[PDB]
Structure formats: structure tokens, C-alpha cells
Design a protein around this nucleic acid. Sequence first.
DNA 1: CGGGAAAATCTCTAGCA
DNA 2: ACTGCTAGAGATTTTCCCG
DNA 3: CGGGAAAATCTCTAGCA
DNA 4: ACTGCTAGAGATTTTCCCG
Lengths: 261, 242, 261, 242, 47, 47, 66, 66
Amino acid sequence: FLDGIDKAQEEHEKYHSNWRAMASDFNLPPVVAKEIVASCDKCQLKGEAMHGQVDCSPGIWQLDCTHLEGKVILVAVHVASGYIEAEVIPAETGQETAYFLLKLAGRWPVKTVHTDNGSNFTSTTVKAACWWAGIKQKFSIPYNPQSHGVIESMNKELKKIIGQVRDQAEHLKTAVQMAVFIHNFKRKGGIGGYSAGERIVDIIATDIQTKELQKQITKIQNFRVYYRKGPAKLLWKGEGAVVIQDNSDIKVVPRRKAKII
Amino acid sequence: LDGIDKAQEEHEKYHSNWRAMASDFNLPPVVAKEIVASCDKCQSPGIWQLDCTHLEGKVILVAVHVASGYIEAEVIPAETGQETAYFLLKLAGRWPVKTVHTDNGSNFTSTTVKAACWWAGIKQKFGVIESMNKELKKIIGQVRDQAEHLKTAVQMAVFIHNFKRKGGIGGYSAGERIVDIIATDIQTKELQKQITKIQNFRVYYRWKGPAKLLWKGEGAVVIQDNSDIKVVPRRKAKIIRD
Amino acid sequence: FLDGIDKAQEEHEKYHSNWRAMASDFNLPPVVAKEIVASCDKCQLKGEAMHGQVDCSPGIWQLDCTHLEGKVILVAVHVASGYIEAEVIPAETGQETAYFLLKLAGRWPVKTVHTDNGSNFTSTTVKAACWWAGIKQKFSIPYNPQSHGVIESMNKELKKIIGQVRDQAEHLKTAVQMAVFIHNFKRKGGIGGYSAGERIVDIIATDIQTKELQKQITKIQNFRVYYRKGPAKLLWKGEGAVVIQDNSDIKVVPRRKAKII
Amino acid sequence: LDGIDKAQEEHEKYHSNWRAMASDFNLPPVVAKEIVASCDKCQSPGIWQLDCTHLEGKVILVAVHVASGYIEAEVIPAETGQETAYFLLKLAGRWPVKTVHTDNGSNFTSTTVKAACWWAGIKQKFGVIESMNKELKKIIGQVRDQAEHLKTAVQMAVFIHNFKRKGGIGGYSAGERIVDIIATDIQTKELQKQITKIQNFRVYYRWKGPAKLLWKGEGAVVIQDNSDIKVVPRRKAKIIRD
Amino acid sequence: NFRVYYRDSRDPVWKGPAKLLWKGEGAVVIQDNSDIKVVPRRKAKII
Amino acid sequence: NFRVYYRDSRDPVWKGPAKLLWKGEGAVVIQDNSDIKVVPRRKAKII
Amino acid sequence: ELQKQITKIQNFRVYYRDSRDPVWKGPAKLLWKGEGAVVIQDNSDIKVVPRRKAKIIRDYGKQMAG
Amino acid sequence: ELQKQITKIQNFRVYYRDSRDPVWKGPAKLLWKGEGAVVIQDNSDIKVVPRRKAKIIRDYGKQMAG
DNA sequence: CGGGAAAATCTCTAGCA
DNA sequence: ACTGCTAGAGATTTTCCCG
DNA sequence: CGGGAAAATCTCTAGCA
DNA sequence: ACTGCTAGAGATTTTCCCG
Ligand SMILES: C[C@@H]1CCO[C@H]2Cn3cc(C(=O)NCc4ccc(F)cc4F)c(=O)c(O)c3C(=O)N12
Ligand SMILES: C[C@@H]1CCO[C@H]2Cn3cc(C(=O)NCc4ccc(F)cc4F)c(=O)c(O)c3C(=O)N12
Ligand SMILES: [Mg+2]
Ligand SMILES: [Mg+2]
Ligand SMILES: [Mg+2]
Ligand SMILES: [Mg+2]
Ligand SMILES: [Zn+2]
Ligand SMILES: [Zn+2]
């Protein structure tokens, strides 16, 4: 193909013909033609067609601002549960946000907050508040809202509920509180058929309780395991398989070729 | 299924509530509830207390969840009905709130507070609150130097009280305690909904008289007839809605 | 449920609780609770999760404008083939568009044009031109670009190619012509592994040729069919099935219970 | 497969091209092409003509596709190289254009036109065009009253010429004709690409000498050995790339 | 009969109930206070 | 090694080739003329 | 005569979509062509398709290939 | 003693996702819980899941129901 | 074992701006 | 070294319930 | 009939603004 | 009475090719 290749590259300079047009018009194997494309900096224009997944741990909260009738609403969602929390604030500042965040930290276990890079969120007073409450801060990749898609979506749902009830209240601060009520207690769905309020209760209580139980289990159940290696620590056994933890690495091995000591 | 008699004996001996009879003897909670409800001898999550305290000439509204000791507090600018109403609606959106106990002050009796309670479905009923205002003030005094404004100090105190202080039997914080209590309440109302859902049926087994339904498992049908709980196969009985 | 219903409706007035929350909290059958929602005008907020499909007939062209370095590019695509046609125009007017459209009508069979409602497209001079060329005009539902998604997508692809070749030319009009070249002849894919240029040739030639052949077939093959009815006209037979056309309705019946006369 | 001998006889008798031998006797077009290329006795889509005409003091550039009679024409403001170049690049993007025949005027020989031809891969080579300018002028005269500006009249004439005028053998318009011709050219170059792709292999059958490959079907392998086309089963032969 | 609720013309506010006149694939014709509208089925709900 | 091409920060212009430093799920750390960037995998291409 | 024309008809490939499915259904045989509908055979299954939903080609590559 | 605690562990349901699939995988049994990983049993298939990808509940409705 | 109806699950969409 | 998501509408499959 | 490699097909995404 | 689409990246399944 030493002839077809030289021609295809020359034509690809002018035209940037994709790999099929070059395979067709120069009798080239697909891999060779595709190689011509892969080596053109001017033809690297499309990102891979996937989505990432956000952290759903019981301690992570996603925060954002949103805007309605010329007012700033600060919103937060426990990602695991869908449970929200919003207040109208006078201004999009680190002072309002640090105060909102201190309140939230005192009402629920807040381990990590994830936000976009709005200046209220990167301010120094929010840093000082998160430091004081023991909150780890995560900022998304700039201009990638998908990173905190949960809270962006919750902005959608909170504004829709506010629309449903705007007229029962006079001031937006009241409609906003009504809407948080409605979301957290009058809307069931998701994993347990729960309302978000019930679901966050279950998540946090389960977290506490499983922690306690597994603690007691590790206190009593104490063995060493050998498979294929070293003295791996036993985590779980049964049903013809043994789950071990060897050098901070959890692997599921069958009961065969595994002896518990 | 086979442990219903063991559970009946355990209840006759020790008067154990349904939770234990269903955790130990592996029974559907409706059945253990029926056993504990068939003996005559064997016979809070939503109640909050609100009060307005004063510090450094500013006004703090304080909500205590009585069962737990868990506080929601803040500085409000003025001791008015509008502000109490807004605080209450916030709390109701955040926690299941059924009853509020206040002290007949001007704000807690306002029309606006009563409107908020009617909207949120809260019942207004006009000792723990005094001692708890005291505790909160002690913590505010401990952390006052750590901020410039009283409102931030208040929120820090609330954080400290709810999560950084452990006492009582199991050395739990108020936040852990309230989460436990509310989870227990959710289990309780799931159970009551289950009881309500199935209390409308009537069963006929082997055909005998009409028996009350308790459970419709995958391999049996647990009923109750003449204050006796009998397990019959599904194919051998017929359940109808009355 | 006469009690639960009355309560659920009252609560749904305040809260607009969804059907699951009402089934849960009032012991209601799903259909009853859902009925409460379906009857609330304030809870009709979401459209059905589907997409329509555009007309792909060999005669339909989709037209649009687009904008690049402060200049107006008029674009057209034969929907069936993907084959495009673009010119920089001095202004977004019905005069430019009627002239562009007359040219396109004289180069290809243009039976129908589909556009958004930009004023250049609804102008009276474009109407007069389409009338003179025998072009039927279709306008999408206003502010629904999806209706002419093909041409909107082609705006995307034309601008990307222009970016790839902008520097080989000096004026945008030239880069635009280069980009139309590239799209129509140096990019293969789609149904026949074709370039759009080859594909439109095949579509239009096939259309002509199948028309001629089926015409001759209907001229020779002349029969009447009875099935189950009236004297239905035969279209195709074979493989134990007969395709008939009864009262402008084409139905495929098996060979059994069907006699050809 | 079985009709290769019938096709060979048909070609020896009538010298029929490969299209007929492959449409009538059901052969892969490579095989019919080999048959029509194995007999010594039996031995345009891209060419356009450009010219600049004049009407009412304005300038019209005219492209005729020679094989078809199909016109692309417009009013250009000035008879320059830049404008010719832009018209040519437009045509090249719209139709497969390989060769342009012009009349050595100032514009058709400009550097800018030559740059456009080099970019588009067109070959410049310096009777139909005169008669066709005439026809186009007649139609422009017929439709002049139907518009205000000459450019619109020109485009109407082009529409009329390409699609509203039918003549010749089958009474086709120029647009139908050009679409046919270009489709035929596409078939031809698909076939040439196929021939090129398979002309690099060598076959060994039953092992006999190296034979030239013609087709690799699903149930056979058609080869050519000693100017003879033999059909062998796939399992009985071995194809290698040389 | 059918009640139609719809969003139309860039207005993020759902309206209705409108009478359904015609249902295609992808769009509906509805009537809303003597005002016949054409709405994409993505942007309507028929009840 | 790997060449990374990417779009970042609201700029619709693809840049690169950058050196890949780290690949997670959903994002990459790349280096581009001594400038370490973090890019969503939706917005990058690794070669 | 007639059989040749019919076998020509059946040489054209049909790409089509069903009323709700956005994927284009792979190449099917053309049996009959109307002003509003093309009759196809797709995997031993004769179907009727509105014309606005069908792309009818020859597939020149496949044809020349055989 | 130990068996009661282990059977309590196995009463909690796990909702989880795999590294690339956006659908939440239906309720699985909890076998073991770590700081970084929960060990599950989903349809007779023991799997390890990063903690950031798992929602662990009790399903109070199901529990009370039995 | 068989249908019908009901419940559950799957598929897909806008808006978050 | 980090990352789309939610909830509703409607379609499709599983489940259950009296024979 | 069996793997490996190659081709084909399927899944999913941004941008059209 | 009208209506999302395209093309590229990467994963997954089908096909083919020498044993
Ligand atoms: C100046 C701060 C910091 C830097 O950037 C700006 C601009 N911005 C833009 C969007 C936005 O485009 N949402 C639409 C969206 C698109 C896709 C998706 F997956 C989720 C989505 F919400 C936001 O939501 C948002 O909060 C902000 C903001 O705060 N800022
Ligand atoms: C004044 C004229 C007439 C009336 O409306 C405006 C505004 N408009 C807006 C878009 C636009 O929003 N494209 C984004 C997009 C979104 C979804 C999808 F499926 C396809 C898409 F292209 C156009 O493309 C467009 O041509 C126009 C236009 O011409 N006008
Ligand atoms: Mg933001
Ligand atoms: Mg936001
Ligand atoms: Mg437009
Ligand atoms: Mg547009
Ligand atoms: Zn390139
Ligand atoms: Zn409602």
C-alpha cells in the first residue's frame, strides 16, 4: 500500500477525509486508514461517548445556587437520599454560604460538600467554616455542571414545586419552604418507595447500625486465611466462597483452595 | 410459622413486646403484633417544644425534639408571629413535626403561626426547654470567642450540642438519637398501614367461619379465629374482601 | 376508601403530593390516587418521553441559516441522502433565499422544502419562487428545531468541517465551498458506506428506475384478488402471501383464503 | 456459476459487454469483466465545459456536463479569475468534476483558477458549448418577462433546460440523464476498486499452478488459469496474498 | 373526550386543558379557547 | 505513551496533544505545556 | 418479461424505520413501490412502510461486488 | 451470638451501580461493609462495590411487611 | 396449567442555565 | 488526582388470582 | 469444530443555538 | 393537520480463516 498511503495522506491534508473514504478511495486496510486519521491533530474533535458517575456516599452533599424572581436560593441535597434543604439568601456571598453551611452541618452529619466554582463557594469564609465543621470540600471540573448533576437536577425539581405552590404564599421565602416540605415529605419514589425524608433517615440510621454491627463482628470473628499466599484476613464466608482482604485488597475466592485458620 | 406457639408462650411468660417476638422467633410483625394485642394483661416522635430566649439583646428561637434532646435554634431579628411562622415551616420541611408545645407568648399564638401550623398539619398545644436553653447558653458562652457574630456562635453551639456531645445510656449524640427515634416511628407507621390494609379482608379455611387475616405469605396464610392464630395452606383457604 | 379519598384530595390541594405518597399515606389503590393527580390542572407539567420522526422522502429538503464570523450561511440538505449545499449570502432575506432556492430547484428535483419560521423563509418572495418551481413548503412547529433536526445537525457538521479547513482559504465563502466539497465527496458512512454525493445519485436514480419498472409491471401484471371481500387489486405475490390494495388500503394476507383472478 | 460457459459462447458470438453478460447469465461482474477482457477482438462522466457568455451587458459563466447536456450557469459580476475559481469550486463540491475544458480566456487561465483546480483535483484542458449557450439564451428570452433581474431569469432558464425539456432517445431531461451517467460511473469505479482489491492474490487448486483470483463466493472460488475460468470448491483450493 | 395540557412557543408555562382535535406521531392539533394550536407530542400530555 | 486531545473551560476549540498523567472513570489529568489540567472523559480523547 | 422486471424490483435494498423506533432497520428487499407506501420483505417478513419512512437504494458497491 | 449479628448484616438491602452502567442495580444483600467497599450478594453472585457507588437501606416497608 | 387484570419494570425525556 | 441526574409518562414484562 | 483476528454492529454523546 | 438528527469513539457480537 506504499503508494495508496502516500496518496491518502496527501489528500487527507487538503480534505481531512475520514477513514472510510480513505479505505474506499485508496484500497487501504481499515487500520492503516484509521492510522492516518489518528495522526492528524486537526481531526481530533470528538470526546468519548460516556458519562461518569458521581460519588453517592452517605456523607456527601451537593450545593448550588439558583435564581427565581430576582432572588438567590441556596440549595443542598444529600446525594444518597435525595433529601433537600434550601433558603433564600440576600446575596450570593461566602458569608451567606458559610452561615447556611454551618447550620446544615449542625443539623445532619455533613462529611463532604461538592459544589461548582461560584465565588461564594470558593470564598475563604466558606473554607474556614468547612474547616471548623470538619467538612471536606470538593469542587467540580470548572464548567462541568454534570459533576454536580444531582443538585442541578434538584434545582429543576425545587423550581417546579415552587411553581405549583407559589400562590399559597406571598413571599418567595415562604413558597420555598413550602416546596422543601413538599419534596422531602409529600413525594414518594426512588429506591424504597420512600419520601426523601424517610430515605435519609434510613440511610443514616443504617450507616450507624451497620457500622456498629460489623464492628462487633470483626471484634469476635477473628481468623486468618490462606489461598492459592499470605495470612489474609477473613471478611465473609459461606455458599462455597470466601471473601478475604489481602494487603488492603478485597477479593472473592471460592471455598476450594482456601483454608481458614 | 412453626414458632407461633413458642412466641405465645414467651409472651405469656415475659410479656415481651412484638419487636422481640418478631426478631427472635422469626414472625411477620403483624403476627407478633396480634399476639401482643390478644392479651389484656399486657396493656412522641413528632412532638417539638419551641421557646424564645434572649442573649446580648438578641432573640433566639429554640426548638427541642423532646424524645431526642436534639435542637434547632437560630437568631431571629424580632420576636414576631411572621418569624416564628417561618422558623416553624422550615423545621416542618426538615423533620416530621406533628405537635408543637409553646408558652402562650405573643408570637406563638399569632394568626400567622396558626396559618403555618394549619398548612403543615401541625397541632398547637399551649421543663426540658428551660434546662436546654441553659445548656445551649453554656455552649454559646464556650464558643463565643470563636466567631464575631452571635448567630454564627449559635449555629456552632447547635452543632456542638447535636453532634459533639454524647451522654445517656449508650453514649449517643442527640443527632444519632433523633435519627433512631424517627426510624422507629417510620417502622411503626409502616406496620400500622399494613394492619389497616389487611384488616378489611375475611378468610374461609378448610368451610369454617370467617377468620381475620394476618399474613399472606408465599407458602401459607396466617389467620386468626376465636382468639386463636392458625396457619393454613394457601390452596386450602379462600380470602375475600369485605 | 370514601374517607381516604376525601383526605387525599384535601391534602393534594395544599401539597400536590404525587400518586405514590397518596397511596402510601391514605391506603388508596394506585388507580384512585393516580386519578386524583390526573384531575389536578396544577400537576400536568411533563410531556411524554418520545421523539417523532421527520419525513425522509426523496423529494424533501431541509433548509436553515447559520452564522459564522458575522456572516450568514444558507444551508440545505436532501434529507434522504445527507447531501448538502451552502452559500454565504449577504443578508438573511427572502430575496437571497428565493434566489438560492431557485438555483437549487434547477439543479436537483426539489419537491418539498421544510424550514423553521425565520422571516426569510416565510417571506412572500420565497413563496412566489416555490410556487414557480413547484416546491411545496412546510414550516415546522414554531420553536421546535427538532422538526428540522437533519438540517440543524448538518449545520453542526458543516461548521466543524469549516473549522478543519478555514486556513487553506482566505474568505469564508471559499472555506464554505471547500467544506461542502469535503462533506459531499470526502466523507463516507451511512447506509451504503457512501459519500453523500454518491448516495443522492443512488437515491434519485433508484427513484426514477423503480418508478419506471413498477410502471411496466402494473401495465402487464393485471389481476383481481378476492380474500376472506371485493375485487382487490394485486400488488405482489409469492412465498405463501399475497399483498393486495383494497380501497386504497394495502394489506398482506396469506396465500390461503385468497384467490387470484 | 454454471453459466460461465454460456456467457463465453455469448461473447464469442455477439461480443456483448460485461453488463449484459452479468445481467442475463447471473455472474459476478468481475467474472463477466474477465470474459470480456480475455478476447482481443472485442477491444466522460467527469468532463465539464466552461464558458463565459454575455447578455444585456452582464456576464454569465456556463458549465455544461458534456455527456449529459446538463447546465450549471449564473451571472457573475466580473469576468475575473477569482469569480471563475469560486464558481468552479462550487461545481466541484456539487458534482464529481475531473476535467474542465475552457477557451484560454483571461479568467480560465488565472493563477486563482489553477489553485482551485489543484485543490479540487481537477485537470484543466485548454462545439457543444456554443449551441448550448444559444439554447440557454433562447430560454432566457422566453422567461425574461417572468422576472425583474437577469440572474433570476438565468436560474429559471437553467431549471427549464435541466428539468422541463425532454429530448433524445428515451425522452429524458438533462437532469435525469446526468444522474444516470454519474450512477453508471459509480458502478464502474466500484468495479475497478473490486478488481484492484482482488488482483493481489494467488490461488492453488486441487496442487496446481498459481491461478488468478476472480471471486470468493460463499460456496465456490472462481479463478482463472491459462486463459481459462474454472470454478473450484472453497475447501479444495487455497488463496494466498502475493 | 380528551384533555390536553401543553407547553408551546418558548413559554415554559404549561397550559390547558385544551380539546384534542387530532393526534399524529410526534404532534397534536389542539383547541384552546377557539385557538387551534399544533404541539409536539414531546410537549403535550393527553388525558 | 498517550496523546490526549481535549476541550476545556467553555472554549469550543479542541487542543492537544497533551500528555496523559492519570485516567479515572469520567475524567483525566493531562499535562499541556507545563499546565496540568483535569478534563472530563466526555471532553477528551486518548490516543 | 415480467419475471425479469420483478427480479429487478427485488434487487433494490430498503432502509426503513418503524413508527416509534429511531434506529434504521437494516437493508430489506423491495417488493413493491407506491406513491405512499413501499412493500418490503425484511428477514422473511413482509411489511408495509409509508414512503416518508423509507430510503431505497441500489447499493452500487454490493451490486458490482456480486 | 455471631450468627445473629451476621443475619442482621444480611438484612440490609444494597442498591449499587457498576463502573459504567447508569442504571441502579436492584436490591442486593449486604454481606460486609468497609470504609471503601461493601461486599454484596446480588442474585447468587458475590460482588465488591466501592462505597461511593452503594446505597444501603433497611427498606422499613419490607421489614415491617415481613 | 390459562387468561385478565394488576403491579413492576423498563425506556426515554426536559431542565437544571 | 474525578465522574449527570431526577421523576414522570407510557410501554412492556412479571405476578397474582380464581378457576 | 476452535480460537484469533478482523469486520460489523450496537451504544451513546455534543452541537445544531 | 406532524414529528431529532448525525457521525465518531469505543464496546460488543458475528464472521472468517487456517488449522
Ligand atoms: C459562575 C458559577 C460558576 C461557573 O459557571 C457558571 C455558570 N453556571 C452554569 C449552569 C448550567 O449550565 N446548567 C445547565 C446544565 C447543563 C448540563 C447538566 F448536566 C446540568 C446542568 F445543570 C449551572 O447550573 C450553574 O450553577 C452555573 C454557575 O454557578 N456558575
Ligand atoms: C428566528 C428564527 C426562527 C425562530 O426561532 C429562532 C431561533 N432559533 C433557534 C435554534 C436552536 O435553538 N438550535 C438548537 C437545537 C436544539 C435542539 C435540536 F433538536 C436542534 C437544535 F438545532 C436554531 O437552530 C435556529 O435555526 C433558530 C432560528 O432560525 N430562529
Ligand atoms: Mg451554580
Ligand atoms: Mg446550577
Ligand atoms: Mg434557523
Ligand atoms: Mg438552525
Ligand atoms: Zn485530518
Ligand atoms: Zn396537583
